Amino acid sequence: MKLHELKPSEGSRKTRNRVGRGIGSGNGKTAGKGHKGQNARSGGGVRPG
Amino acid sequence: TTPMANASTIERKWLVVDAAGKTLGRLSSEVAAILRGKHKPTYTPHVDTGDHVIIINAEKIELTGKKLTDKIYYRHTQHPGGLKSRTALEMRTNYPEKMLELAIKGMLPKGSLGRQMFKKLNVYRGSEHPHEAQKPEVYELRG
Amino acid sequence: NRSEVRGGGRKPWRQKGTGRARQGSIRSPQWRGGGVVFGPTPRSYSYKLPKKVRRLAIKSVLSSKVIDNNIIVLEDLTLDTAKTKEMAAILKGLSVEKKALIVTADANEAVALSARNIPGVTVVEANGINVLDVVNHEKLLITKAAVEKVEEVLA
Amino acid sequence: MYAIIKTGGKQIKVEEGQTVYIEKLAAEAGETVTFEDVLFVGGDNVKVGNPTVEGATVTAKVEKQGRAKKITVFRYKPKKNVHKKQGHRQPYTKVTIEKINA
Amino acid sequence: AVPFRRTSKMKKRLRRTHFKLNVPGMTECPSCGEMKLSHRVCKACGSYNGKDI
Amino acid sequence: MQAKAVARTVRIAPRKARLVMDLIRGKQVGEAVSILNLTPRAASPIIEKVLKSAIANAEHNYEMDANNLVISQAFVDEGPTLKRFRPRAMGRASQINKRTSHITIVVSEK
Amino acid sequence: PRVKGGTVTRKRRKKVLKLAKGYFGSKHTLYKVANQQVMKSGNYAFRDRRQKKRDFRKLWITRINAAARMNGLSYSRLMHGLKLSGIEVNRKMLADLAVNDLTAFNQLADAAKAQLNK
RNA sequence: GACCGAUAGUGAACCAGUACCGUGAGGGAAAGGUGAAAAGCACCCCGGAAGGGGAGUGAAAGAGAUCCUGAAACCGUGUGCCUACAAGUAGUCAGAGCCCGUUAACGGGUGAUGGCGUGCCUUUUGUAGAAUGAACCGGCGAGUUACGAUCUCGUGCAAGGUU
RNA sequence: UAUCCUUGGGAGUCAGACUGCGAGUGAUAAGAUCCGUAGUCGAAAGGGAAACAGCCCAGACCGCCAGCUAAGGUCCCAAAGU
RNA sequence: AACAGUGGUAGGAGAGCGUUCUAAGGGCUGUGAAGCCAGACCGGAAGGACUGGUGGAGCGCUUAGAAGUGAGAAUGCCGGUA
Ligand SMILES: [K+]
Ligand SMILES: [K+]
Ligand SMILES: [K+]
Ligand SMILES: [K+]
Ligand SMILES: [K+]
Ligand SMILES: [K+]
Ligand SMILES: [K+]
Ligand SMILES: [K+]
Ligand SMILES: [K+]
Ligand SMILES: [Mg+2]
Ligand SMILES: [Mg+2]
Ligand SMILES: [Mg+2]
Ligand SMILES: [Mg+2]
Ligand SMILES: [Mg+2]
Ligand SMILES: [Mg+2]
Ligand SMILES: [Mg+2]
Ligand SMILES: [Mg+2]
Ligand SMILES: [Mg+2]
Ligand SMILES: [Mg+2]
Ligand SMILES: [Mg+2]
Ligand SMILES: [Mg+2]
Ligand SMILES: [Mg+2]
Ligand SMILES: [Mg+2]
Ligand SMILES: [Mg+2]
Ligand SMILES: [Mg+2]
Ligand SMILES: [Mg+2]
Ligand SMILES: [Mg+2]
Ligand SMILES: [Mg+2]
Ligand SMILES: [Mg+2]
Ligand SMILES: [Mg+2]
Ligand SMILES: [Mg+2]
Ligand SMILES: [Mg+2]
Ligand SMILES: [Mg+2]
Ligand SMILES: [Mg+2]
Ligand SMILES: [Mg+2]
Ligand SMILES: [Mg+2]
Ligand SMILES: [Mg+2]
Ligand SMILES: [Mg+2]
Ligand SMILES: [Mg+2]
Ligand SMILES: [Mg+2]
Ligand SMILES: [Mg+2]
Ligand SMILES: [Mg+2]
Ligand SMILES: [Mg+2]
Ligand SMILES: [Mg+2]
Ligand SMILES: [Mg+2]
Ligand SMILES: [Mg+2]
Ligand SMILES: [Mg+2]
Ligand SMILES: [Mg+2]
Ligand SMILES: [Mg+2]
Ligand SMILES: [Zn+2]
């Protein structure tokens, strides 16, 4: 192998999803959280169970 | 490729229409079309391709039904309670040229070009007109 | 972050009535000179592959050097005087133009000193061989003693 | 003399020597194309097709295979975060009309 | 009462059509030849109506 | 040939200088000096000195006849603003822009 | 590592402003309003590429109707007669003849009249 | 140092816990860049000066002192096209006329006139909305990291795997 | 005709609206309210109903200065029958 | 090739663009780097070149890696200017 021609195994690495980076991505604005309520808030949602 | 008439290309005839015994609206609709140039195959929407129209015997225009008594020409002076009215009989007797002009103006396009198209209309009460110099042809309404 | 920035204790102005946007601290992140939201924090990037994967990696790159014909096995590498001119002459003698990893069995002082100043020439013991050094240097110059010492561990 | 021919799902009035842009034909620059469907021939000997003029052809030399000036198709819906940008360059064949064979 | 909308550059410029100085009501002094205001003493030479003031 | 003069960062508001400049732009330099002399405005003496400086540059540097000169360009650009504050009622301050002007005249031979 | 805002923002906004050249006042000058107008222009251009096909057909029909009536036919009857005769010359071409070669148009109108008078 | 690079990085790259604010505890800024070298513009000219035009220095002075670069808003000067009968979310499509001539393209600028057309965002059953937000421009400004859990995918080994 | 089921990963939603039809509440009032049922809007641009989320017609990958139709229209504004 | 499909909010899934830094390889640059300004060029989009001007010393490209990675709205913060 060469350091200038490195290649990962196919399906070993994916690009991370970055929310709140514009409408084209499909996670713009509300960042996949929908509208309002406890689940859309920072630190939101109820405890497990 | 579709040709477009322009100020250079356009050539306007002068037409005389006799209003005597003609129904106001039926005459008006045909004249409005001639002023717009709808009868010309060089008709172009954004320029005035139409012909000049002289109307004579405007006082002899006819109205069906009881429209002489019952058709009312309203206008408002933009002052409070400033709605004025004249009957069609009053219009035909005293303001026959305005009556035809009002009918035709309402049938022309609205906007700058429509206002320009109206300038080629010339309406006269009696039989005579002063446009001998323009050499006007008689135009019979198709109807 | 907003906690670690100097000052910023008080509410800049009252909640209501001023006509300004409500603000809680002069060091809130939207403020110039305010705290950073997230951003870098000290952390390690290290992780360990399974030992068998580590062995397969080193054997893979060593076996790759044999395929490419970038393996120069030496009978011995004994520089008498620790002199860079001599090491440079030996590398010219072996047609080693570009980078090279020299691999001795034990810690050879004279070889290590002589090669130290030549760009792109690293010296390691047999135990100090590693994937990145092997892959980064074109030629691999191993002594016979070192090959035996590598084969002791890996095989 | 002129002819009305059908090509590219459209009709074009052509004279001899005229350069015309039409929808992309499967041909190369230099090649001779023939237009079979001639709906009408004008000038002196007027021929009216039904639908086509029987035996009439128009031949033409292919000047260029190109793509037209770019259209940026941009569409959005107010208040719904729906934007859609799409470039378009429509292929054409530029032909010079050689001979109307009425 | 406050501006409901800001005034455009155009409208500001249209308003300033008449906000303009006039050229002084000036004539050549018959004594010294400098320009003076008509019906005023010439500041340069101090003359008015062919008389030193 | 052209001769230029500039008065940079003169303490007069650009709008006020431009009123007077509009009177002299295009004019023959003799006529311009007369207009400025008889225009009762704060900008007049300032603009006069720039005009006379440009005329002197034309004579001395470029060897141009002063009687044949015309104002070919004349304009006021904005200089840097001196920011001040006026105490208003109720303990409020309101900004005062003490504006400056760069005043350019270019004279050329007719 | 820190990524500064850098040049990407200026480059993107400037392209929008160049698309807004010729727009009135602040619409060619300020990014926010230029952006809105370029977006609106997209919606309008898409709509009007469709309306263009309607407007030209409307224009050709008007011209064919005028020429037809010079030959003593309405547009309605002319097109019926052309359809019965199997003439497939489209409205663009018929309107082209109506303006450019009216004698050729009249032959097609005569062909239509022949079918109608059957 | 796969840390920052002057709105960042310390509050503080600079005479900063200063200036300034507060009776006090206390709060707490802004502000980096001439040039390789001062060679920091002798001298002449307008001006009281400021400032400028030459001249000289310099590779460069449109590097001449908050003096590298020098965006945008914003303010001006000049003028190619249009504009004083017009009803305008300002564009878009159609389109003469006039003026140009390119990354040479079924080109560029302008736009008489015609058709169509109630900004953007947020929030809503529904907003051109007479609901909300933004004066404008620029910069900065929001799902991160650690350690656990789980699933998918990948790789090694496999009834073993792993420290 | 090409859906359906199971298991596992990830959601969002829990203010609905009008229209037709079947009911309640109301006064067999409400652009009212509350259910059932179908549609459209929501999340759907295009044509028609002057304008007009919810009606009528119809689902916009993109280009064309081709053609045929839908609702609705064909004296003039305004395309097509005085 | 043929056949079929391609409106879309919340939202799921995929493929990409660009930014800073690092590694390796290979380059550019005082015969003018980045930045900036202009243009009638190119790509399905994000975007990318080319030419000229300014600028006066740095910077691409390829493959992989890592993120302070993309702004038009927060009565956002700071500055400038209306
Ligand atoms: K989600
Ligand atoms: K600070
Ligand atoms: K201008
Ligand atoms: K228009
Ligand atoms: K309110
Ligand atoms: K119902
Ligand atoms: K450059
Ligand atoms: K972030
Ligand atoms: K803001
Ligand atoms: Mg979505
Ligand atoms: Mg948004
Ligand atoms: Mg929200
Ligand atoms: Mg809710
Ligand atoms: Mg929710
Ligand atoms: Mg604190
Ligand atoms: Mg900080
Ligand atoms: Mg007081
Ligand atoms: Mg950095
Ligand atoms: Mg930014
Ligand atoms: Mg159609
Ligand atoms: Mg800086
Ligand atoms: Mg700081
Ligand atoms: Mg004190
Ligand atoms: Mg410079
Ligand atoms: Mg330098
Ligand atoms: Mg500078
Ligand atoms: Mg006028
Ligand atoms: Mg009038
Ligand atoms: Mg409500
Ligand atoms: Mg309003
Ligand atoms: Mg609210
Ligand atoms: Mg507001
Ligand atoms: Mg802003
Ligand atoms: Mg319900
Ligand atoms: Mg209800
Ligand atoms: Mg049921
Ligand atoms: Mg909703
Ligand atoms: Mg649906
Ligand atoms: Mg509709
Ligand atoms: Mg409508
Ligand atoms: Mg809506
Ligand atoms: Mg039909
Ligand atoms: Mg009609
Ligand atoms: Mg879809
Ligand atoms: Mg579809
Ligand atoms: Mg997703
Ligand atoms: Mg950089
Ligand atoms: Mg360049
Ligand atoms: Mg960021
Ligand atoms: Zn005197």
Scan residues 70-89 of G and list those with Cβ closer than 8 Å to B. 70
Distance from chain centroid for Cα D76: 32
Q: Choose from E13, E23, E42 for mutation: most chain F CBs within 10 A.
A: E23
CA D53 from chain centre, in angstroms, equals 19
Token pair of G102, please?
């009216």
For residue B64, give the DSSP letter: -
What gap in Å lies between CA C144 and CA C146, rounded to an integer? Answer: 5
Q: What is the DSSP letter of D41?
A: E
What are the DSSP calls for E7-43, one per residue? PPHHHHHHHTTS--PPPP-EEE-TTT--EEETTS--T
Cβ–Cβ < 8 Å for C24, C11: yes
User: How many Å apart are CA E38 and CA A46, to the nearest integer?
Assistant: 91
Counting the structural domains of chain C, the total is 1
**Strand H bases contacted by the protein (CB, 7 Å):** 2-12, 17, 27-30, 44-47, 49-54, 71-78, 85-87, 89-97, 105-107, 109-116, 119-124, 127-129, 135-147, 153-157, 161-163
Classify burial at G76, counting beta carbons within 10 Å of its beta carbon; exposed 0-12, middle 13-18, buried 19 or more. Answer: exposed
Smallest CA–CA distance, residue D85 to chain A, in Å, is 10
Using the CB atom, is residue F78 less than 7 Å from strand J?
yes
d(CA G110, CA G118): 13
| Sequence letter at residue A7 | K
The tokens describing C3, both together, are 């906690």
Residues 6+ apart with CB under 8 A from F89: none
Nearest in space to F14 (alpha carbons), one of F3, F26, F22: F22
- How many angstroms separate the CA atoms of F80 and F102, rounded? 9
For chain D, the residue count is 102
Residue C2 and residue C34 in contact, taking contact as beta carbons nearer than 8 Å: yes
Structure token pair of residue G33: 């309003």
Q: Which helix (H) or strand (E) holds G98?
A: helix G91-100
- Asked if C99 contacts C121 with a C-beta cutoff of 8 angstroms, the reply is yes
* Chain A residues touching residue C64 (CB < 8 angstroms): 1
Say yes or no for a CB contact (<8 Å) between A3 and C135: yes
Domains held by chain B: number: 1
Decide if D74 and G111 are in contact by the 8 Å CB cutoff. no
For residue B32, give the 3-state DSSP assignment. Answer: helix
Cα F35 to Cα E22: distance, rounded to the nearest angstrom: 10
Question: F66 near F77, Cβ under 8 Å?
Answer: no
Ligand nearest to the CA of E13: 3
Q: F29 and F66 in contact (C-beta within 8 Å)? A: yes
Pairwise CA distance, residues E13 & E22, whole Å: 18
Reduce the DSSP state of residue C35 to 3 states and report it: coil
Residues of G numbered 25-44 whose beta carbons fall under 8 angstroms of chain D's beta carbons: which are they? 38-39, 41-43
Give dist(CA G73, CA G79) in Å, integer. 10
Determine the distance between A28 (CA) and H103 (C1') in angstroms. Answer: 37
Supply the range of the domain harboring residue F9.
2-110
Count the alpha carbons within 13 Å of C87 in the hemisphere toward its beta carbon: 24
Q: Which residue type is seen at G10?
A: R
Residue nearest to nucleotide H161 (CA to C1'): C50
Alpha helix ranges (H) inside chain B: 24-36, 67-70, 88-94, 96-107, 112-118
Range of the domain at C129: 1-154
Q: Is D45 helix (H, G, I), strand (E, B) or coil?
A: coil
Alpha carbon distance C25, D72 (integer Å): 46
Instruction: Considering all nucleic acid strands, name the nucleotide whose C1' atom is nearest to the C-alpha of residue D66.
Output: H106
Cβ-based neighbour number of residue F85 at 10 Å:
10
Taking the CA of residue C107 as centre, how many other CA atoms within 13 Å lie in the half-sphere pointing to its CB? 1
Instruction: Judge contact between F51 and F27, C-beta under 8 A.
Output: no
**CATH number of the CATH domain containing F33:** 3.90.470.10
In chain D, domain spans: 2-102
From the CA atom positions of chain C, what is the Rg in Å? Answer: 28
- Residue F35 CA to ligand 50 center (angstroms) comes to 15
Solved with: cryo-EM
Coil, strand or helix at B55: strand
G59 to B45: CB separation less than 8 angstroms, yes or no: yes
Number of domains composing chain E: 1
Q: Which of residues 12-41 of F touch strand H (CB under 7 A)?
A: 14-15, 18, 22, 25
State yes or no: cis peptide before E3, omega within 30 of 0. Answer: no
CA distance D57 to D72: 38
**How many Å lie between the centroid of ligand 31 and the Cα of residue B40?**
59
* Chain-centroid distance, C-alpha C52: 21
D75, D46 contact by CB (below 8 A): no
What DSSP state is assigned to residue A9?
A: P
Rounded to the nearest angstrom, the minimum Cα separation between F98 and chain E is 21
Report phi then psi at C147, rounded to 5.
-55, -45
Residue of A nearest to C60 (CA): A1
Nearby residues of D80 by Cβ (< 8 Å), 6 or more positions away: none
The answer to whether strand J lies under 7 Å from the CB of residue G14 is yes
DSSP state of B44: -
> Which phi and psi (to 5°) does residue D100 adopt?
-85, 110
Partner residues linked to F109 by β-bridges = F69
Closest among C130, C73, C132, C77 to C107, alpha carbons compared: C77
- What distance in Å separates the CA atoms of residue B93 and residue B60, rounded to the nearest whole number? 9
Residues of chain C (123-142) having a beta carbon less than 7 angstroms from strand J = 136
Distance C110 CA to ligand 26 centre (A): 57
Residue of D nearest to G110 (CA): D48
**Nucleotides of chain J touched by protein CB (<7 A):** 8-16, 18-21, 23-25, 35-48, 62-78, 80-82
Residue C100 CA and nucleotide J64 C1' are separated, in Å, by: 22
The chain B residue lying nearest G91, using CA atoms, is B2
Computed from CA positions of residues C126, C130, C131, C134, in that sequence, does the dihedral angle turn out positive or negative?
negative
Tell me which residue of D32, D6, A17, F19 sits closest to E23, measured CA to CA. Answer: F19
CA-based nearest distance D81→chain A, Å? 6
The total of structural domains in chain F comes to: 1
